[PDB]
Symmetry: none
Subunit: 107 residues, 2 copies
Amino acid sequence: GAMATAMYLEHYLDSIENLPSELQRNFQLMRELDQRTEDKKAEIDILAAEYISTVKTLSPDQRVERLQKIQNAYSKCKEYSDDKVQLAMQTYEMVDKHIRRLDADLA
Amino acid sequence: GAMATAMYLEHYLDSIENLPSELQRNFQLMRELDQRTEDKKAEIDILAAEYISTVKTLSPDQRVERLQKIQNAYSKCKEYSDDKVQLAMQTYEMVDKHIRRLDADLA
Ligand code: NA
């Protein structure tokens, strides 16, 4: 059913500029949350790359410093990732609600 | 419009370094904007292809992840087409004002 997928997708995309109020909200919350996730990813990239290059210049405590510090950033990034997945599923019901009504009014 | 603008560029054919700064800026922005506009429309076609071809096997959370990217790109084209209209309007109204000084002077 690629026909219906496409048809519904199109009809949806012509409705973006006035979605339901709670749906815009959810998309905005997901955007802000995606930012927190993108930033923590770029942050982890540094701590990783920095640790790799400057690896030999480190004692046993200075190694256990960076790892236990990176563990904190990975754990934090995961909270965001897990939250997004929940906020996404919640939003999917709203999108399915909207497309059904949208396409009922177009029939 | 275009014809006026074509004749304006024909006047400076050799001496394009004489051509006003506000106008030389705008003529580039129009060319840059057209690339960014033409890229986003292509990106949307690919993203929509991915979505049509794999929606059946995608979980609700993943269906929303895809929909985020397509929405945002679709918003960006809408934005880039409003930008192109208003930039060409401003560029054309500038060219007209510059034509009135050169060719259509009141003396
Ligand atoms: Na006069």
